[PDB]
Amino acid sequence: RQAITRAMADQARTIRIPVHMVEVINKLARVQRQMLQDLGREPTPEELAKELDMTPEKVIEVQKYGREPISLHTPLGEDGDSEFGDLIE
DNA sequence: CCGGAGCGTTCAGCGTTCGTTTATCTCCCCCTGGCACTGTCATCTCCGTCAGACCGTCGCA
């Protein structure tokens, strides 16, 4: 489990994230999911900040860092030739 | 009728203040290493192209 999650931290994401930041973001994700299934609603970032004992600015920074890139080759729709990479200057 | 005083400008003694560095002390980031009841084979793909060719492949003759 240790080696698999270490390689998941160091290799799964294209923009590499250090292992401590990976465990921080997935702990935040799992406690957010727990609060969502308990309260039945999306938890406010302030309550997440108090329950994680971190500052709200740290919480929103963590949510910002927890993203996934989108490929430049995703088609828009019916047309195959018009790409997502040709709409950005 | 030069002489002195006051005034303008310009420099040599030491006296303080800056401009730019240096090693030490907190706070944080980041990577490698530990966990000891057992727990020893996933995963859904893919169908109502399509049109015929080009080609190698392959078992029957």
Which residue, A21, A71, A55, A25, is CA-closest to A45?
A55
How was this structure obtained?
Answer: cryo-EM
Strand B, nucleotides < 7 Å from a protein CB: these are 29-32, 34-35
Residue–nucleotide distance: A35 CA to B7 C1' (Å) = 89
Residue–nucleotide distance: A66 CA to B6 C1' (Å) = 83
Concatenated DSSP letters of A9-44 = HHHSSSS---HHHHHHHHHHHHHHHHHHHHHSSPPP
Residue–nucleotide distance: A14 CA to B49 C1' (Å) = 36
The 3-state DSSP class for residue A83 equals strand
- Listed resolution, Å: 3.3
Q: Which two tokens stand for residue A45?
A: 């970032």
Q: Count CA atoms within 13 Å of residue A72 on its CB side.
A: 5
